[PDB]
Every structure is written in structure tokens, then in C-alpha cells.
Amino acid sequence: EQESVKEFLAKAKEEFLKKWESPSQNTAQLDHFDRIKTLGTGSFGRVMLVKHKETGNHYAMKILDKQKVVKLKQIEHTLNEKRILQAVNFPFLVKLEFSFKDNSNLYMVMEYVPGGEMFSHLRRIGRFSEPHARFYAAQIVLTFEYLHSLDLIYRDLKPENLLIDQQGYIQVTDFGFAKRVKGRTWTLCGTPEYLAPEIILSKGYNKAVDWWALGVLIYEMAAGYPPFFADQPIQIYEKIVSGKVRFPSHFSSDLKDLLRNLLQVDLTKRFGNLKNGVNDIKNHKWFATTDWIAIYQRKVEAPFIPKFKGPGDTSNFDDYEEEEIRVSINEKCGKEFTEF
Ligand SMILES: CC(=O)N1CCN([C@H]2[C@@H]3OC[C@@H](O3)[C@@H](N)[C@@H]2O)CC1
Ligand SMILES: CC(=O)N1CCN([C@H]2[C@@H]3OC[C@@H](O3)[C@@H](N)[C@@H]2O)CC1
């Protein structure tokens, strides 16, 4: 490994471990913010655009209902998410600014990324050219090199979880399945189209599942649709475990070669999981034009700058039913969330 990379990752791990061992807690409260608009929803709860009443700064506030987290069996995952987010620091990761809890809910207040989800831009344009896909892929490669060096598996890569910032760079969001793992882990989680075969087959799996998901993402960016597509999950799973994929004829030979090595069903042969680790990916011919240092330093001109009017603009996010943020007069699930 290059001395620069080695000493960078050694320092990255030292800094992560100090915050991991002593997590920040209770750094704001709900009535410090005005609620503006719902930016998205899921089983996790909701994300709202908020404005800090004193500073005027905008944030994306993820709100989880403690009782629903318990019923959906996501306690450990939610504690993982907040503890990891408060400890990481990398140019292409969403930045957690505050966290707190009250009688009913857990709150993670993040810097707001007004360019919207990669998913929207991909569906609007149709597919990205190879250079455009490669610019985003390089940022994911560097982000996974960082996360994996901290013993973190991400487990939720997909276009809806990649936001585009004001400079056209990626911010990875949604650490709801991220976990610190030395060795293997066993939980079935993630979106069907992006699951590695070893997840579908209920094996103990490792960080190689993130490199499989990178293969799916690159294919989807360059084709406009994912490589394993079907109407029901059970049919998607059959395609994933088969060891066959079809590439559009417009794909370059270098892209097809990279994808055969990322979408390798045998995890012991998959790029990212060999002796050379991430360097088999960084040194692959498809990445020959990539200036890894300049990408990290955000010195490369992005292929695309999202249109938006200012830090409060919500036009790149879609419209959701607006519901109350209720806080019970009685504490719910206090024991389960003591460490949050
Ligand atoms: C940092 C920022 O600007 N964020 C945080 C994350 N959210 C969520 C929202 O909830 C579900 C859906 O939209 C999801 N794909 C998205 O990542 C968007 C706004
Ligand atoms: C029956 C149904 O599907 N509904 C009921 C009414 N809502 C409106 C109404 O206006 C303010 C508030 O109730 C909000 N929930 C929403 O916008 C749409 C969803």
C-alpha cells in the first residue's frame, strides 16, 4: 500500500475509535427547530427539513418512533446507526450534526443535501454515460475503503441512498443497517435487487457484500436498470444466485470485465475480497482515467450540478403527506434506548 493511504487510514481508525468509545449524546432538542416539510418516509419513520431557530441553518432531521422501532425489531440496528454516524468523518458521508431523544422519538439531525437522490436524476436522464457513472463509483470505492478499514459494513447501497450535493459530489446516507463487524455477520437486511448471494443463502457473510452491491450499482447507473430485475423478490433471488448476467452491447469491454469480477457469486473470488483488497478495483482498466487523489480532494469537475435555488429548496425531493410529530406525556421504551 502507498504510504499516504496507509497513514491516512491509520489516523482515520484512531479518530473513529475515540468517538466510538465515547459517543456524543443529547446535543439539541426538538423545540430548537421549526418544521418545514417532509422529505421522505419509510418503515424507519420520516425525514423532515427543519430550520434551526437561532442560526437559521437548514437540516434533515430523521425521526424514529421508539415503539415502532421495537415492534419492527430494529433496536440494535438503530443504536448501530447513531453510534457509527456520530463517529465517522469522510468527504462522501452525510454529516450528523445533532442527536437527541424524547418521550416518544429518536432524532438524528444531519446536514441537508438539496440536490436530491441519485435515483431521481438517474431515472430522469435514463442512464449515465460511463464517465459519469465512473465519477460516482470512484467516490463509493473510496468510501468503502474508509468504512471497511474501520471494520464497518454498510449493507444498504442503492441509488436512493446516494444524495447529490451542491458541487455534484455524492453523500452516502442511511446507516440503518451499518454495523461494526470483525469477521462475519448473519442478519438478512437490504433491498432485494442489491443483495449478494451469500445473504440470500443465509450464510455468515462479510464486507464482500458491499463490493457485490457496488457491482449492482455500477451496472444500474450505466444501463438504467439493475442486472437482476423481476416482479417479485423470490424471482430476483433466483437470478442473483445463478451466476449469469446479461450486459447491454453499449457497455465497454473494460466495464463488462470489472462487473464480472464484482458480480462474482463465489465470494472468495470477488474483487474487493482478494489479497490486494481495494487495489484490484482501483487499478482496474475501467478506472485507468480516475485521479483517486483529486476525487478525494474534490478537485475534479463533476459531470452534473443539480439545479436548486438555495439551501432551503426542496424541489429535488418529492411530496409526502404531512403528519404530526407527537411527543407523549409518558416515556416510552426508555430502557431499550438508554445509550442513544
Ligand atoms: C441528508 C439529507 O438531505 N437527507 C437525509 C436522508 N433523506 C431520506 C428521505 O427519507 C427517505 C428517503 O428520503 C431517502 N432515500 C433519503 O435518503 C433525504 C434528506
Ligand atoms: C383519507 C386520506 O387518505 N387522507 C385524509 C386527509 N389528508 C390530508 C388532510 O389535510 C391535512 C391532513 O389531513 C393531512 N393528513 C393531509 O394533507 C390526506 C390523507
CSV table of C-alpha atoms and ligand atoms in Angstrom, one decimal:
chain,number,residue,atom,x,y,z
A,1,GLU,CA,0.0,0.0,0.0
A,2,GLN,CA,1.0,3.6,-0.6
A,3,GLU,CA,2.4,5.3,2.5
A,4,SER,CA,-0.2,8.1,2.1
A,5,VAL,CA,-3.1,5.6,2.1
A,6,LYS,CA,-1.6,3.6,5.0
A,7,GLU,CA,-1.0,6.6,7.3
A,8,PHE,CA,-4.4,8.1,6.3
A,9,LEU,CA,-6.3,5.0,7.2
A,10,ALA,CA,-4.3,4.5,10.5
A,11,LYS,CA,-5.3,8.1,11.6
A,12,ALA,CA,-8.9,7.6,10.4
A,13,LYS,CA,-9.2,4.5,12.6
A,14,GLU,CA,-7.7,6.2,15.6
A,15,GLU,CA,-10.1,9.1,15.3
A,16,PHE,CA,-13.1,6.8,14.7
A,17,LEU,CA,-12.3,4.7,17.8
A,18,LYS,CA,-12.1,7.6,20.1
A,19,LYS,CA,-15.6,8.7,19.2
A,20,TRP,CA,-16.9,5.1,19.1
A,21,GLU,CA,-15.8,4.5,22.6
A,22,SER,CA,-17.3,7.8,24.0
A,23,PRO,CA,-20.3,8.7,21.9
A,24,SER,CA,-21.9,12.1,21.9
A,25,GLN,CA,-25.5,12.3,23.2
A,26,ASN,CA,-28.3,14.8,23.7
A,27,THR,CA,-26.8,17.7,21.8
A,28,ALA,CA,-30.1,19.5,20.8
A,29,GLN,CA,-33.8,19.4,21.5
A,30,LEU,CA,-36.9,19.5,19.3
A,31,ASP,CA,-38.2,23.0,20.1
A,32,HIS,CA,-34.9,24.4,18.8
A,33,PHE,CA,-36.1,23.8,15.3
A,34,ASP,CA,-39.0,24.8,13.0
A,35,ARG,CA,-40.5,22.0,10.9
A,36,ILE,CA,-40.7,22.9,7.2
A,37,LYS,CA,-41.6,19.8,5.0
A,38,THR,CA,-41.4,16.0,4.9
A,39,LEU,CA,-38.6,14.9,2.6
A,40,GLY,CA,-39.1,11.2,2.7
A,41,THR,CA,-40.6,8.3,4.7
A,42,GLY,CA,-40.1,4.6,5.3
A,43,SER,CA,-40.5,1.9,7.8
A,44,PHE,CA,-37.9,3.8,9.8
A,45,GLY,CA,-40.1,6.8,10.3
A,46,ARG,CA,-39.7,10.1,8.5
A,47,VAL,CA,-37.1,12.7,7.4
A,48,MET,CA,-38.1,16.3,7.7
A,49,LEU,CA,-36.5,19.5,6.5
A,50,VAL,CA,-36.1,21.7,9.6
A,51,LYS,CA,-34.6,25.2,10.3
A,52,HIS,CA,-32.7,26.0,13.5
A,53,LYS,CA,-34.5,28.9,15.1
A,54,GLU,CA,-31.4,30.8,16.2
A,55,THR,CA,-28.8,30.2,13.4
A,56,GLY,CA,-31.3,29.8,10.6
A,57,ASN,CA,-29.4,26.8,9.2
A,58,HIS,CA,-31.3,24.0,7.5
A,59,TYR,CA,-31.0,20.3,8.4
A,60,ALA,CA,-32.6,17.0,7.5
A,61,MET,CA,-34.0,15.5,10.7
A,62,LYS,CA,-34.6,11.8,10.8
A,63,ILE,CA,-37.3,11.0,13.3
A,64,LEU,CA,-37.8,7.4,14.5
A,65,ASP,CA,-40.8,6.3,16.7
A,66,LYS,CA,-39.3,4.2,19.6
A,67,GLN,CA,-42.4,2.0,19.9
A,68,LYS,CA,-42.3,1.2,16.1
A,69,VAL,CA,-38.5,0.6,16.2
A,70,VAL,CA,-39.2,-2.0,18.9
A,71,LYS,CA,-42.1,-3.7,17.0
A,72,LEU,CA,-40.0,-3.9,13.8
A,73,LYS,CA,-37.1,-5.5,15.7
A,74,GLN,CA,-34.7,-2.6,14.8
A,75,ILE,CA,-33.4,-1.6,18.2
A,76,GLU,CA,-29.8,-2.8,17.7
A,77,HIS,CA,-29.8,-1.6,14.1
A,78,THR,CA,-30.9,1.9,15.3
A,79,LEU,CA,-28.3,2.0,18.0
A,80,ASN,CA,-25.6,0.9,15.5
A,81,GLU,CA,-26.8,3.7,13.1
A,82,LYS,CA,-26.4,6.6,15.5
A,83,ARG,CA,-23.2,5.3,17.2
A,84,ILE,CA,-21.5,4.9,13.8
A,85,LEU,CA,-22.7,8.2,12.3
A,86,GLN,CA,-21.5,10.2,15.3
A,87,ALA,CA,-18.0,8.6,15.0
A,88,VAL,CA,-17.2,8.7,11.2
A,89,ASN,CA,-15.7,11.6,9.1
A,90,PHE,CA,-15.2,11.3,5.4
A,91,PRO,CA,-15.9,13.7,2.4
A,92,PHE,CA,-18.7,11.5,0.9
A,93,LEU,CA,-20.7,10.6,4.1
A,94,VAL,CA,-23.6,12.6,5.4
A,95,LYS,CA,-22.7,14.6,8.5
A,96,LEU,CA,-24.6,14.1,11.7
A,97,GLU,CA,-24.8,17.5,13.5
A,98,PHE,CA,-27.1,16.7,16.5
A,99,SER,CA,-28.8,13.8,18.1
A,100,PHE,CA,-31.4,13.6,20.9
A,101,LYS,CA,-34.4,11.7,22.1
A,102,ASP,CA,-37.7,12.4,24.0
A,103,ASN,CA,-40.6,10.5,25.4
A,104,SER,CA,-41.6,9.1,22.0
A,105,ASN,CA,-38.9,9.5,19.4
A,106,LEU,CA,-35.2,9.4,18.5
A,107,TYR,CA,-33.8,12.2,16.3
A,108,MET,CA,-30.7,12.4,14.1
A,109,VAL,CA,-30.2,15.9,12.7
A,110,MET,CA,-28.0,15.8,9.6
A,111,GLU,CA,-26.7,18.4,7.1
A,112,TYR,CA,-29.3,18.9,4.4
A,113,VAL,CA,-28.2,17.9,0.8
A,114,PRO,CA,-30.6,19.9,-1.5
A,115,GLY,CA,-29.6,18.2,-4.8
A,116,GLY,CA,-31.8,15.2,-4.1
A,117,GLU,CA,-31.3,11.4,-4.6
A,118,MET,CA,-29.2,10.0,-7.3
A,119,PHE,CA,-32.2,7.8,-8.1
A,120,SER,CA,-34.3,10.8,-9.3
A,121,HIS,CA,-31.5,12.1,-11.6
A,122,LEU,CA,-30.8,8.6,-13.0
A,123,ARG,CA,-34.5,7.9,-13.8
A,124,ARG,CA,-34.9,11.4,-15.3
A,125,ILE,CA,-31.8,11.1,-17.6
A,126,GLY,CA,-32.3,7.4,-18.3
A,127,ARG,CA,-28.8,6.2,-17.9
A,128,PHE,CA,-25.4,7.8,-17.1
A,129,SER,CA,-22.5,7.7,-19.5
A,130,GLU,CA,-19.5,5.6,-18.4
A,131,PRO,CA,-17.5,8.7,-17.3
A,132,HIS,CA,-20.5,9.9,-15.3
A,133,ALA,CA,-21.0,6.5,-13.6
A,134,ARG,CA,-17.3,6.2,-13.0
A,135,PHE,CA,-17.1,9.6,-11.2
A,136,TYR,CA,-19.8,8.4,-8.7
A,137,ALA,CA,-18.3,4.8,-8.5
A,138,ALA,CA,-14.9,6.2,-7.6
A,139,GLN,CA,-16.4,8.0,-4.6
A,140,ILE,CA,-18.1,4.8,-3.4
A,141,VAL,CA,-14.9,2.9,-3.8
A,142,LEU,CA,-13.1,5.4,-1.6
A,143,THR,CA,-15.9,5.5,0.9
A,144,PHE,CA,-16.0,1.7,1.3
A,145,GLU,CA,-12.2,1.6,1.6
A,146,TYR,CA,-12.6,4.0,4.6
A,147,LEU,CA,-15.6,2.2,6.2
A,148,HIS,CA,-14.1,-1.3,5.8
A,149,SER,CA,-10.8,-0.2,7.3
A,150,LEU,CA,-12.9,0.8,10.4
A,151,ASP,CA,-14.4,-2.8,10.4
A,152,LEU,CA,-17.8,-1.3,9.3
A,153,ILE,CA,-20.0,-3.0,6.8
A,154,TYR,CA,-22.5,-0.6,5.1
A,155,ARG,CA,-25.2,-3.0,3.7
A,156,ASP,CA,-27.6,-0.5,2.2
A,157,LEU,CA,-26.0,0.7,-1.1
A,158,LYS,CA,-28.6,1.8,-3.7
A,159,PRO,CA,-29.4,4.9,-5.8
A,160,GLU,CA,-32.0,6.2,-3.4
A,161,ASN,CA,-29.3,6.3,-0.6
A,162,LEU,CA,-26.9,8.5,-2.5
A,163,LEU,CA,-27.5,12.2,-2.4
A,164,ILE,CA,-26.0,14.8,-4.8
A,165,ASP,CA,-24.5,17.9,-3.2
A,166,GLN,CA,-24.1,21.5,-4.5
A,167,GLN,CA,-20.8,20.6,-6.1
A,168,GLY,CA,-22.2,17.4,-7.8
A,169,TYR,CA,-20.5,15.0,-5.4
A,170,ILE,CA,-22.1,12.1,-3.5
A,171,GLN,CA,-23.1,12.0,0.1
A,172,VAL,CA,-23.9,8.4,1.3
A,173,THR,CA,-26.9,8.4,3.7
A,174,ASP,CA,-28.9,5.8,5.6
A,175,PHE,CA,-26.7,3.9,8.1
A,176,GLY,CA,-29.7,2.0,9.4
A,177,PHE,CA,-28.1,-1.4,8.5
A,178,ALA,CA,-24.4,-0.4,9.1
A,179,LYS,CA,-22.6,-2.5,11.7
A,180,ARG,CA,-19.1,-2.8,13.2
A,181,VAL,CA,-18.1,-6.4,12.4
A,182,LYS,CA,-14.8,-8.2,12.8
A,183,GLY,CA,-15.4,-11.3,10.9
A,184,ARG,CA,-18.9,-12.4,9.7
A,185,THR,CA,-22.4,-11.3,10.4
A,186,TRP,CA,-25.8,-13.0,9.7
A,187,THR,CA,-28.7,-10.6,9.6
A,188,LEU,CA,-31.0,-10.7,6.5
A,189,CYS,CA,-31.3,-7.0,5.5
A,190,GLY,CA,-31.1,-4.8,2.5
A,191,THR,CA,-33.0,-4.2,-0.7
A,192,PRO,CA,-33.6,-7.3,-2.8
A,193,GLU,CA,-32.0,-6.1,-6.1
A,194,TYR,CA,-28.7,-5.3,-4.2
A,195,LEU,CA,-28.3,-8.4,-2.0
A,196,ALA,CA,-25.3,-10.6,-2.5
A,197,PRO,CA,-25.9,-14.4,-3.0
A,198,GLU,CA,-24.4,-15.2,0.4
A,199,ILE,CA,-27.1,-13.0,2.1
A,200,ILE,CA,-29.9,-14.7,0.2
A,201,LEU,CA,-28.5,-18.1,1.1
A,202,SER,CA,-28.5,-17.3,4.8
A,203,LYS,CA,-24.7,-17.7,5.2
A,204,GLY,CA,-22.4,-15.9,7.6
A,205,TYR,CA,-21.2,-13.0,5.3
A,206,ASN,CA,-18.6,-10.2,5.4
A,207,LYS,CA,-17.6,-6.9,3.8
A,208,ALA,CA,-17.6,-8.6,0.4
A,209,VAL,CA,-21.4,-8.0,0.2
A,210,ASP,CA,-20.6,-4.2,-0.2
A,211,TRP,CA,-18.4,-4.9,-3.2
A,212,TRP,CA,-21.2,-7.0,-4.8
A,213,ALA,CA,-23.6,-4.1,-4.2
A,214,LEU,CA,-21.1,-1.8,-5.9
A,215,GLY,CA,-21.3,-4.1,-9.0
A,216,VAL,CA,-25.1,-3.8,-9.0
A,217,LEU,CA,-24.9,0.0,-8.6
A,218,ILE,CA,-22.4,0.5,-11.4
A,219,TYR,CA,-24.5,-1.8,-13.7
A,220,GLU,CA,-27.7,0.2,-12.8
A,221,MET,CA,-26.0,3.6,-13.4
A,222,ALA,CA,-24.6,2.6,-16.8
A,223,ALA,CA,-27.7,0.6,-18.1
A,224,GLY,CA,-30.5,2.5,-16.4
A,225,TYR,CA,-31.9,-0.7,-14.7
A,226,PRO,CA,-30.4,-3.2,-12.3
A,227,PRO,CA,-28.9,-6.5,-13.5
A,228,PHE,CA,-31.3,-8.8,-11.5
A,229,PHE,CA,-34.8,-7.5,-12.1
A,230,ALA,CA,-38.2,-9.3,-11.6
A,231,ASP,CA,-41.7,-8.7,-10.4
A,232,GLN,CA,-41.3,-10.5,-7.0
A,233,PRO,CA,-38.4,-10.8,-4.6
A,234,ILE,CA,-38.3,-14.6,-4.9
A,235,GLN,CA,-37.7,-14.3,-8.7
A,236,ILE,CA,-35.0,-11.7,-8.1
A,237,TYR,CA,-33.2,-14.0,-5.6
A,238,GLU,CA,-33.2,-16.9,-8.2
A,239,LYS,CA,-31.5,-14.7,-10.7
A,240,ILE,CA,-28.9,-13.4,-8.2
A,241,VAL,CA,-27.8,-16.9,-7.1
A,242,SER,CA,-27.5,-18.2,-10.7
A,243,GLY,CA,-24.1,-16.8,-11.7
A,244,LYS,CA,-25.3,-15.4,-15.0
A,245,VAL,CA,-25.8,-11.7,-16.1
A,246,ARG,CA,-26.5,-10.1,-19.5
A,247,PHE,CA,-24.7,-6.9,-20.4
A,248,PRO,CA,-26.0,-4.3,-22.9
A,249,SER,CA,-23.9,-4.1,-26.1
A,250,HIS,CA,-23.2,-0.4,-25.4
A,251,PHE,CA,-21.1,-1.4,-22.3
A,252,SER,CA,-17.4,-1.2,-22.9
A,253,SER,CA,-15.3,-4.3,-22.6
A,254,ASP,CA,-13.5,-2.8,-19.6
A,255,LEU,CA,-16.8,-2.2,-17.8
A,256,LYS,CA,-18.0,-5.8,-18.5
A,257,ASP,CA,-14.7,-7.2,-17.1
A,258,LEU,CA,-15.0,-5.1,-13.9
A,259,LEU,CA,-18.6,-6.1,-13.4
A,260,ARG,CA,-17.9,-9.9,-13.9
A,261,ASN,CA,-15.4,-9.6,-11.1
A,262,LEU,CA,-17.6,-7.6,-8.7
A,263,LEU,CA,-20.8,-9.7,-9.5
A,264,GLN,CA,-18.8,-12.8,-8.8
A,265,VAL,CA,-21.1,-15.3,-7.0
A,266,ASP,CA,-18.2,-17.0,-5.2
A,267,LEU,CA,-17.2,-14.5,-2.5
A,268,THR,CA,-13.7,-15.9,-2.3
A,269,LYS,CA,-13.1,-14.8,-5.9
A,270,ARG,CA,-14.8,-11.4,-5.8
A,271,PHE,CA,-12.9,-8.2,-6.4
A,272,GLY,CA,-12.5,-6.2,-3.1
A,273,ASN,CA,-12.1,-9.5,-1.2
A,274,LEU,CA,-8.8,-10.8,-2.7
A,275,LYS,CA,-5.3,-10.4,-1.4
A,276,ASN,CA,-4.9,-6.9,-3.0
A,277,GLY,CA,-8.1,-5.7,-1.4
A,278,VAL,CA,-9.5,-2.5,-2.9
A,279,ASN,CA,-6.4,-2.1,-5.1
A,280,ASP,CA,-7.7,-4.7,-7.5
A,281,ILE,CA,-10.6,-2.3,-8.1
A,282,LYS,CA,-8.6,1.0,-8.1
A,283,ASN,CA,-6.1,-0.5,-10.6
A,284,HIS,CA,-8.6,-2.0,-12.9
A,285,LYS,CA,-8.6,-0.7,-16.5
A,286,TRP,CA,-12.1,0.7,-16.2
A,287,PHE,CA,-10.7,3.2,-13.7
A,288,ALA,CA,-7.5,4.0,-15.6
A,289,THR,CA,-8.5,7.6,-16.1
A,290,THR,CA,-9.6,8.1,-12.5
A,291,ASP,CA,-7.4,10.6,-10.4
A,292,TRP,CA,-8.1,9.0,-7.0
A,293,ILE,CA,-6.4,11.8,-5.1
A,294,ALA,CA,-8.2,14.6,-6.9
A,295,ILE,CA,-11.6,12.8,-6.3
A,296,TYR,CA,-10.9,12.6,-2.6
A,297,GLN,CA,-9.8,16.3,-2.6
A,298,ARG,CA,-13.0,17.3,-4.5
A,299,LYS,CA,-10.9,18.9,-7.3
A,300,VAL,CA,-12.5,17.1,-10.2
A,301,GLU,CA,-15.2,19.0,-12.0
A,302,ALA,CA,-18.5,17.0,-11.6
A,303,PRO,CA,-20.4,15.8,-14.6
A,304,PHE,CA,-23.6,17.3,-13.3
A,305,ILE,CA,-24.6,20.1,-10.9
A,306,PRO,CA,-28.2,19.7,-9.6
A,307,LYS,CA,-30.5,22.7,-10.1
A,308,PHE,CA,-31.8,24.2,-6.9
A,309,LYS,CA,-32.3,27.8,-5.6
A,310,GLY,CA,-30.7,27.7,-2.2
A,311,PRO,CA,-30.2,25.7,1.0
A,312,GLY,CA,-33.9,25.7,1.8
A,313,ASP,CA,-35.0,24.5,-1.6
A,314,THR,CA,-37.0,21.2,-1.6
A,315,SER,CA,-37.7,21.0,-5.3
A,316,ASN,CA,-35.5,17.9,-5.8
A,317,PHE,CA,-37.4,15.9,-3.2
A,318,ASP,CA,-41.0,14.7,-3.8
A,319,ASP,CA,-44.2,15.4,-1.9
A,320,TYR,CA,-45.4,13.3,1.0
A,321,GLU,CA,-48.5,13.5,3.2
A,322,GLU,CA,-47.7,15.9,6.1
A,323,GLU,CA,-48.3,14.3,9.6
A,324,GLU,CA,-47.9,15.4,13.2
A,325,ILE,CA,-44.7,14.9,15.3
A,326,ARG,CA,-46.3,13.8,18.5
A,327,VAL,CA,-44.5,13.5,21.8
A,328,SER,CA,-46.2,11.5,24.5
A,329,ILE,CA,-46.6,12.9,28.0
A,330,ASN,CA,-45.2,9.5,29.2
A,331,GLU,CA,-41.8,8.0,28.4
A,332,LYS,CA,-41.8,5.0,26.1
A,333,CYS,CA,-39.1,2.4,25.8
A,334,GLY,CA,-36.6,4.3,27.9
A,335,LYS,CA,-34.6,1.2,28.9
A,336,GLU,CA,-34.2,-0.1,25.4
A,337,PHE,CA,-32.8,3.3,24.1
A,338,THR,CA,-30.7,4.2,27.2
A,339,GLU,CA,-27.5,4.5,25.2
A,340,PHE,CA,-28.9,6.7,22.4
B,1,LIG,C1,-29.1,14.5,4.5
B,1,LIG,C2,-30.4,14.7,3.7
B,1,LIG,O1,-30.5,15.7,3.0
B,1,LIG,N1,-31.4,13.8,3.8
B,1,LIG,C3,-31.3,12.6,4.7
B,1,LIG,C4,-31.9,11.4,4.1
B,1,LIG,N2,-33.2,11.6,3.5
B,1,LIG,C5,-34.0,10.4,3.1
B,1,LIG,C6,-35.5,10.7,3.0
B,1,LIG,O2,-36.2,9.7,3.8
B,1,LIG,C7,-36.4,8.5,2.9
B,1,LIG,C8,-35.8,8.9,1.6
B,1,LIG,O3,-35.9,10.4,1.6
B,1,LIG,C9,-34.3,8.5,1.5
B,1,LIG,N3,-34.0,7.9,0.2
B,1,LIG,C10,-33.5,9.8,1.8
B,1,LIG,O4,-32.1,9.4,1.9
B,1,LIG,C11,-33.2,12.7,2.4
B,1,LIG,C12,-32.7,14.0,3.0
B,2,LIG,C1,-58.2,9.8,3.9
B,2,LIG,C2,-56.8,10.2,3.5
B,2,LIG,O1,-56.1,9.4,2.7
B,2,LIG,N1,-56.3,11.4,3.9
B,2,LIG,C3,-57.1,12.2,4.9
B,2,LIG,C4,-56.8,13.8,4.7
B,2,LIG,N2,-55.4,14.0,4.4
B,2,LIG,C5,-55.0,15.4,4.3
B,2,LIG,C6,-55.7,16.4,5.3
B,2,LIG,O2,-55.2,17.7,5.2
B,2,LIG,C7,-54.3,17.9,6.2
B,2,LIG,C8,-54.1,16.5,6.8
B,2,LIG,O3,-55.3,15.9,6.6
B,2,LIG,C9,-53.0,15.6,6.0
B,2,LIG,N3,-53.0,14.3,6.7
B,2,LIG,C10,-53.4,15.5,4.5
B,2,LIG,O4,-52.9,16.6,3.8
B,2,LIG,C11,-55.0,13.3,3.2
B,2,LIG,C12,-55.0,11.8,3.6
